[PDB]
Design a protein around this ligand. Sequence first.
Ligand SMILES: CCCCCCCCCCCCCCCCCC(=O)OC[C@H](COP(=O)([O-])OCC[N+](C)(C)C)OC(=O)CCCCCCCCCCCCCCCCC
Ligand SMILES: CCCCCCCCCCCCCCCCCC(=O)OC[C@H](COP(=O)([O-])OCC[N+](C)(C)C)OC(=O)CCCCCCCCCCCCCCCCC
Ligand SMILES: CCCCCCCCCCCCCCCCC[C@@H](O)O[C@H](CO[C@H](O)CCCCCCCCCCCCCCC)COP(=O)(O)OCC[N+](C)(C)C
Ligand SMILES: CCCCCCCCCCCCCCCCC[C@@H](O)O[C@H](CO[C@H](O)CCCCCCCCCCCCCCC)COP(=O)(O)OCC[N+](C)(C)C
Ligand SMILES: CCCCCCCC/C=C/CCCCCCCC(=O)OC[C@H](COP(=O)(O)OCCN)OC(=O)CCCCCCC/C=C/CCCCCCCC
Ligand SMILES: CCCCCCCC/C=C/CCCCCCCC(=O)OC[C@H](COP(=O)(O)OCCN)OC(=O)CCCCCCC/C=C/CCCCCCCC
Ligand SMILES: CC(C)NC(=N)NC(=N)Nc1ccc(Cl)cc1
Lengths: 347, 105, 309, 71, 70, 114, 94, 83, 166, 98
Amino acid sequence: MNPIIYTTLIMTVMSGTMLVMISSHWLLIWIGFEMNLLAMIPVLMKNFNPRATEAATKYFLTQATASMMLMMAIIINLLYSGQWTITKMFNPVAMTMMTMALAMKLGLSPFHFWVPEVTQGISLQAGLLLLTWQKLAPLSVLCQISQSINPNLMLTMAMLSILIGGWGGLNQTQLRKIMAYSSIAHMGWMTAVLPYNTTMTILNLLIYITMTLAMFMLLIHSSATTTLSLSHTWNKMPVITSLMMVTLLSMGGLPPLSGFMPKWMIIQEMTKNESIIMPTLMAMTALLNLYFYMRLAYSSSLTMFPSTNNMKMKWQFEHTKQMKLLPTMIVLSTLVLPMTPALSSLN
Amino acid sequence: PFFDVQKRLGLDLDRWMTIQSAEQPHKIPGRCHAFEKEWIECAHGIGGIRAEKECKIEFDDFVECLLRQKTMKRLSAIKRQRDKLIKEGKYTPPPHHLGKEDPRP
Amino acid sequence: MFMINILSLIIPILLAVAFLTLVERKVLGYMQLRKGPNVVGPYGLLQPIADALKLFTKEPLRPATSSISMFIIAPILALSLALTMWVPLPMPYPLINMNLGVLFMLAMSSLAVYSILWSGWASNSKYALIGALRAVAQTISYEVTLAIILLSVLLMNGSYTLSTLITTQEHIWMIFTSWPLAMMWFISTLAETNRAPFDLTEGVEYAAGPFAMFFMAEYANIIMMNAFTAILFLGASHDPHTPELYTINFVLKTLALTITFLWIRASYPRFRYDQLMHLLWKSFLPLTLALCMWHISLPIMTASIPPQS
Amino acid sequence: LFQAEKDRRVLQMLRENLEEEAIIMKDVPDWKVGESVFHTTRWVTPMMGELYGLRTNEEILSATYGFIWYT
Amino acid sequence: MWFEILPGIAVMAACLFIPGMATAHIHKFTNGGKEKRVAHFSYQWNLMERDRCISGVNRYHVTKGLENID
Amino acid sequence: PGIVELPTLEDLKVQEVKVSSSVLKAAAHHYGAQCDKPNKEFMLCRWEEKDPRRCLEEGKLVNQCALDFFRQIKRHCAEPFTEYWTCIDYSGLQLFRHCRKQQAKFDECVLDKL
Amino acid sequence: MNIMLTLLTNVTLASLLVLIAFWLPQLNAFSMKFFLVAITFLLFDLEIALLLPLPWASQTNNLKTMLTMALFLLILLAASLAYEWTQKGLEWAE
Amino acid sequence: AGRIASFLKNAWAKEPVLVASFAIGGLAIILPSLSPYTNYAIRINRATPYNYPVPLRDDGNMPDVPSHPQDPQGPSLEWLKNL
Amino acid sequence: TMYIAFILSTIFVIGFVGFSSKPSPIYGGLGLIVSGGVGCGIVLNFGGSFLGLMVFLIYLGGMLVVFGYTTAMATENKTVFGAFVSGLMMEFCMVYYALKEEEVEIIFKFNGLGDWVIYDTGDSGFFSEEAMGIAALYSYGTWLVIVTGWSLLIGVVVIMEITRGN
Amino acid sequence: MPLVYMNIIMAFAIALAGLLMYRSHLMSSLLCLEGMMLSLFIMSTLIILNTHFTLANMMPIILLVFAACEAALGLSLLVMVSNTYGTDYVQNLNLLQC
Ligand SMILES: CCCCCCCCCCCCCCCCCC(=O)OC[C@H](COP(=O)([O-])OCC[N+](C)(C)C)OC(=O)CCCCCCCCCCCCCCCCC
Ligand SMILES: CCCCCCCCCCCCCCCCCC(=O)OC[C@H](COP(=O)([O-])OCC[N+](C)(C)C)OC(=O)CCCCCCCCCCCCCCCCC
Ligand SMILES: CCCCCCCCCCCCCCCCC[C@@H](O)O[C@H](CO[C@H](O)CCCCCCCCCCCCCCC)COP(=O)(O)OCC[N+](C)(C)C
Ligand SMILES: CCCCCCCCCCCCCCCCC[C@@H](O)O[C@H](CO[C@H](O)CCCCCCCCCCCCCCC)COP(=O)(O)OCC[N+](C)(C)C
Ligand SMILES: CCCCCCCC/C=C/CCCCCCCC(=O)OC[C@H](COP(=O)(O)OCCN)OC(=O)CCCCCCC/C=C/CCCCCCCC
Ligand SMILES: CCCCCCCC/C=C/CCCCCCCC(=O)OC[C@H](COP(=O)(O)OCCN)OC(=O)CCCCCCC/C=C/CCCCCCCC
Ligand SMILES: CC(C)NC(=N)NC(=N)Nc1ccc(Cl)cc1
């Protein structure tokens, strides 16, 4: 792919998301979604191989079905209200269809399989962009339409997402599938807190994006896509393994790291509204995520797996490409707990 | 979520198309222009919760103009009663409804 | 009376198709220094009848490995769409006066593309299928070009009404106004109708009766295209009290255009497939877009925007 | 002139329909004659069904499809 | 010679004359010797309906005038 | 909610202008020039009241003005007007372009008489 | 109604002729280059669909804006054609 | 100007169709801006009456609003008549 | 009345049932063509002449032609008949319910009295409201034109890149 | 709401169900995807024309354009998959596992 074409497609994806986030018209929001998907498909199919083609095909099918459902919901809402402005939807059936379409776009359970499938199919940069941006946009739409969301359905989908992410991450071995299930669990947390405080939703989004960027960029730096491939990193650059370990600890919600702040704020907000059982179950279920994070950290940082012989040549040579904002994302993902009251600024 | 660039910069990207009581080409009015205008003027500036709680008469009038559910129900009831009456033969249509009348210019 | 009008529109078209076959044979003969059919009837005025009778009383060869549904539908669709495109044409009064007649013609042509694909896929033969695919590609490309040209021309008419076209051409000719568009329109109509130099398909499975259906559909399409071109670029003067003058003039212009079709077929060699494909996308399409821009800008810069009504 | 004629025709048709409704629905337990379905007292443009509900099928078809089917 | 092509062209012209002439004759016959009304717009359709109503014989082409009003 | 008030059929009766569209279109500019005041009053009433029931008297006045206008035309220029609207009626579109002679004669007649 | 009757008559006559001709003697007893043409045709057809409502758009009072938008659409169509030309999407080499 | 002149000369001998298309497009883009009749076209489009001219209630402070269609006040299409 | 629009809608649903039962790609394409023609008839009968002709032209001539063209250049059961029968039975049951009374037990509430009843007595003059609204895409709708053109150009680039291979 | 809207919504639901129930081919899935857009276009144009929403008449055209672009993208993906595997069967798309 030509660099000019690649940057044009990236800017088209970003422009589609910006159009979705700045448009007050349902037709314009749908147009932004269509543009985002259209420009996103080649980014997935950059490195051409049958696995990438299959991942792109599955992603296209899922996103097209979600877009059709979203347009149907828009039309149904227009039928009973005659309004195009994105506000509290005036029809429960249209609201349910919109919620299901946005859940399918985000990856919430039971619409989650395509997330690990595509993430394994595509490369690390494609997975990073996919997760981050393609979860950034529908969450903005949901935050705009929050006041009409059915709490029962939203919380059911959120809890299912958390459980499914935990169990999938427990069983998986591939780094990209682990990241996909982590994304599913964090989206579950965000959508669980969504019907109560969109500010907490945005805070969780920002923290999750920072941690995911840090983890994916560390994986790109180490050029590891499996557990055993990552197990050789300690013999070439042990600093990266330690940074990855602290990032994994933060993603598990362990205090006093940055990952504990979203869970803490969400628990507080949900327990303000006389909801105890849901926060308790959500907090207890994150232990599965922390378990597979710790299992991944054992193989890379806290132990020394056997190495190979060409690693000496690896030592002789030096990394050339420099990651952008990697130290900043590492610091922001582990040491911003004492700056929690900035959520008022985020408000 | 919603960065109101249109309101910040004074643009009109889609607010012209948002509602059907706005400026239409050749001043073509909508089907329910009056009802929508009344609902908007009732609900403006009081917030979503108060708009839903208070402008219920206006919203119901707008929805009735849009869908014509109650009017269709009333017409169907009248038609059903007329059909039942003419089945027994008690009621007979007038000449104009029967088809022998002079229309109006 | 409407059924009488429909029949008066339909049957003379088929008779004209048959005698157009006869006229094409005679004109080709006289251009090639031969004489053409002058034996079957007086000056050969029984050859279409003899050919029709033979093709009807000829044995068919329907393949065993063929979809009978498509094999029957394709000629029916082709003939129906060939006959349908005559109802909005004014001469001087259309049978069905439509506010948007041009879009109806475009839709009818686009549907008429389906006949080639269905006939190719009905034979269940690989080579006929490949030929049908190439024909479909050529037809859709020249459909794009025809649509852009027809959009460009009607910007000086004000609407999609052929009666309004006549009113516009009351004074002078759209061929005088926009002759490059006339050139490209004529060439694109040739390519769409698959006449020489664009008869790549004929340069097979159907025989006997069903073949005659396709032949009649193609010749009716040729006559309809010539009549449409005559109306669009060679508008005649219409007198409301004596409409027959316009009918005579329109028929003469249509005959002249069809005779020009036959003349070109006799005169010129055949294009290659890739050569004719490059002829459009690299020579006609850029000029068509430029002329579309020019014809959009011209009424605004000269304050000559046609009336909507 | 056409606006006045249209208003007069619409009012006459509405009055005829009201009289026929009063004649027919004279035995329903609770049925007000001429009752509106809107909370407002503002004039509402009559629907096509409100005008041609009780008339002949030929007139109904003419009123609903005459302009569409005329070519 | 080349004029032997004329009989076929003559037959083609005779065949192509029939549609337009027949359509014009039928339009004049079914409308009382006048061109068929072109109702391209709702205003024209309303005019036709008003003409039919004022004629009262259920024919829009039966025109009435000053002798009808007074 | 509420009962729709409708005028009775007795007050909805008025002498209609029983002329065809061709006749109306032939005498269109003159009709608009001569009966401008009642027509404008009725249109203003309709656009301000937004209710057909509130402007019946204006409609009756419009009908009366139209009838007076047509009677005045018939008293003086009945034959030129008849020729003009016969010429207009023939055209399917009822164009003014094809009757520039009958229109000229009618305009000469009305200018000299009225 | 008239158009429906005309279509029915045309279809009926075509079917009758086809069936008469069929039974009168029967008395008794992926190429990638070809695919890209279809996609390019579809995209240009969508552009044509956008460009169709031009005759009515010339009657508006915002003539400058309408002209700018029409020229913008045509320039984008030309740019798509030029991009395909330069990237060899119109080549029939093999 | 030698290089551009040579480029135009070569293009006019190798791709005359492309040269003609680009020239036509350039003229189409530029000419309407540098034309005096665009304002006339806009005025003609604005002068065409589609909707009914709903009258105004007289208040005694409308000197420029005519009281009759034939009154000298109000817009005049004399420019369109002589065009 | 004659319930012409209702009959057209029923035919539309039947064609959809067939093409969703999917006996084969070609037969499904033909059923989709039939359903598109029926929908164009529905919108034309309602009064959207330009939109109906636009759907006809675009959908059938360009969109379903390329589908068949791709299918024709590839050439690569009791379930279909069972699905078709089930769909026909469901549609007939819904039609019978709606005709007998207001079928409100569905997620929506439907009242059947007439598509002529649901119409309005308003009318325009010397212009088409649909045509003017669609032509307002240039006077108004400047943003829509820009975003749609950019989307089309990006789609051209996308289909160029994906089919490249490598 | 009248019965025409009911039939259009039922057609959309049937098309959606057909897409979600694959049989052998990916082409049939794309066909079912395009039927949903046809139903959406019909519903949108009926709603807009019924309420005389003049400025909304341009929405169905934009919807049709974007959905046709999506259809072209899907056809490109389908032909790439067919060139890779030999058939357009959805059974071959199983290299990636959940
Ligand atoms: C094999 C493929 C077949 C595909 C199609 C299968 C289904 C066919 C469905 C037919 C629907 C008919 C719709 C029109 C109904 C009447 C509406 C009406 O009055 O419209 C007035 C309008 C008037 O035109 P207008 O647009 O000028 O209207 C404005 C002017 N006023 C309002 C004054 C009338 O008529 C039309 O628009 C005419 C075009 C109709 C297009 C739809 C029918 C296409 C038929 C050809 C395709 C099918 C051929 C099959 C051949 C045999 C194959 C085996
Ligand atoms: C096979 C060799 C063909 C050689 C060329 C034949 C056509 C000659 C025209 C130039 C070449 C073709 C260019 C494209 C078509 C141009 C059409 C054109 O201009 O046509 C001109 C005339 C019609 O144009 P016109 O001059 O009559 O129309 C006037 C138009 N207004 C009023 C708007 C200014 O048509 C013909 O000459 C017909 C030629 C084909 C038919 C040949 C057989 C008939 C011979 C003449 C019979 C005359 C009596 C007929 C009955 C009269 C009853 C009252
Ligand atoms: C609008 C469509 C019109 C189509 C026709 C237009 C042109 C018509 C030209 C016809 C000129 C007359 C032809 C006469 C040919 C010779 C007739 C005769 O020789 O044949 C007889 C039998 O032939 C027929 O009976 C004559 C048929 C003449 C033509 C009839 C009209 C053409 C049919 C039109 C069909 C149109 C629909 C088809 C469209 C494709 C056998 O006679 P025979 O055994 O030796 O008797 C001994 C000879 N003697 C008496 C001199 C001693
Ligand atoms: C203001 C600061 C902007 C900063 C960001 C700029 C870049 C953002 C991305 C591009 C945004 C384009 C802005 C579109 C807003 C449209 C509204 C504005 O432009 O008014 C229009 C004015 O029309 C003008 O002609 C501008 C048309 C749009 C600009 C020309 C095309 C630019 C395309 C840019 C993107 C191209 C993508 C592909 C690049 C190759 C519409 O006119 P309108 O008010 O309603 O009615 C007529 C009233 N008039 C007569 C007084 C104007
Ligand atoms: C250079 C390109 C040529 C290659 C491609 C050409 C393909 C042609 C294949 C030739 C095989 C012949 C069968 C295919 C056409 C079938 C035509 C047909 O069905 O005709 C039926 C009809 C039957 O008689 P009726 O008219 O119905 O009754 C009155 C009797 N007097 O006509 C006949 O007489 C034909 C009957 C016998 C002919 C069939 C005998 C040969 C069959 C062997 C199988 C060959 C199939 C070919 C496979 C092609 C792919 C390898
Ligand atoms: C003497 C002239 C007087 C008038 C002069 C006025 C100014 C004229 C300016 C003309 C600009 C010059 C353009 C000509 C150069 C075009 C490039 C060229 O020469 O051809 C190369 C090559 C063709 O060669 P091939 O046969 O395909 O391959 C050969 C293999 N051995 O061209 C290309 O690569 C494509 C480049 C152009 C793409 C055209 C696509 C459609 C664009 C035209 C639409 C016009 C829109 C108008 C907009 C204008 C404002 C932007
Ligand atoms: C191009 C060659 C094969 N054609 C002919 N010389 N005549 C022709 N196909 N025969 C014919 C004549 C009239 C009719 Cl209605 C139908 C078919």
